[PDB]
Amino acid sequence: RKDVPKVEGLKLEHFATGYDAEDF
Amino acid sequence: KAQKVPIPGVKQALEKKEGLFRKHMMGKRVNYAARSVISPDPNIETNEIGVPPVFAVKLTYPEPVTAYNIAELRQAVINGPDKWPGATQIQNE
């Protein structure tokens, strides 16, 4: 009962308003 | 009682739900009636029905003129059958 191959390489995009590229 | 499908005699047009006596006497079609799809509305009275203007310019009702309703009948006949509180035809004496 191994799981399915995890999506190698997700990234984060649910972010805020009035701001362009303030994720570092 | 005689010799694909024969011709209906005068009894044969009278005996079923189809035929005459159960369809055109118990079940007469009417004048002054309409039907539609219905729709909900909470913003009116519960004892009311909201009617389109298509139906409000068709279904007439005879209003006899007297000394009190002449004023709401002038503004009926001034409007005529395109402005909603109006009249389609008047009957003479």
């Binding site: - | 009636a33 509305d41 009311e48 029905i49 909201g50 203007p53 005879p62």
Partner: protein
């Protein structure tokens, strides 16, 4: 009006006509789906119309939708809010629902209009707020007193009623009485309002007013609450998500 499988006599009732511009279909209130059991998704209703004044009285005083409040099959009521007008009662008559002063002068006039024949006293009469000194607020249950104050005729005293709900006492916390509906002289003093009050359920609030005041008041109170629980719904929505 006439739904086509017409089994019982409440499937062919009498209505009053309100012409609505800018529309295309016949348009009926929700609470008169109890008597036809017609759902608003593809049904046809033959609207017949009488042509003489011996029939315009017999479409008001024998076969209106106001004498058709009780079905003769069992004596049960057939007319009542329906889906969301129930689920606004639990939010309006809760003990957390507080309203400011402008809101309490709003939801009254949002549902009650003197300009149509809702009021009696020719002037909307109000109540004092249940909080004075910090910040004056009216309780949500107190609006239900106010709609039952305006439309009941003034020669009568208030209502008195003891009844239950489908909501039990353990949900609202510890030791809280919220199951005994308790009206005293027209004032709601305890208890939320459910299908057990103004649905198709016998011995509610609306079925109580139907016997005390006559069927013309019990038709108005459904047409007042049926816009009180919508001008509140337009001011506060109700949802169903994935948290539940």
């Amino acid at each position: 009006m006439n739904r086509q499988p017409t089994l019982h006599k409440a499937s062919m009732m009498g209505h009053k006509v309100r012409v609505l511009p800018n529309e295309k279909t016949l348009r009926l209130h929700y609470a008169n789906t109890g008597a036809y059991n017609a759902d608003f998704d593809g049904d046809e209703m033959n609207m017949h119309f009488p042509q003489n004044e011996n029939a315009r009285a017999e479409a008001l005083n024998l076969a209106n939708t106001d004498s058709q409040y009780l079905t003769p099959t069992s004596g049960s009521p057939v007319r009542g809010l329906i889906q969301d007008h129930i689920s606004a009662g639990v939010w309006l008559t809760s003990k957390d629902s507080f309203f400011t002063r402008e809101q309490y002068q709003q939801y009254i006039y949002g549902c009650i209009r003197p300009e149509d024949g809702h009021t009696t006293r020719s002037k909307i009469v109000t109540l004092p707020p249940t909080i004075f000194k910090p910040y004056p607020l009216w309780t949500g249950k107190q609006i239900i007193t106010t709609v039952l104050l305006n439309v009941t005729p003034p020669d009568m005293p208030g209502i008195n009623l003891i009844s239950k709900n489908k909501i039990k006492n353990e949900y609202w916390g510890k030791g809280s009485l919220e199951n005994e509906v308790l009206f005293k002289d027209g004032a709601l003093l305890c208890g939320i309002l459910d299908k057990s009050q103004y649905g198709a359920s016998k011995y509610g609030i609306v079925h109580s007013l139907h016997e005390v005041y006559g069927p013309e008041v019990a038709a108005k109170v459904l047409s007042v609450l049926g816009r009180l629980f919508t001008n509140y719904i337009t001011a506060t929505a109700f949802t169903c998500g994935m948290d539940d």
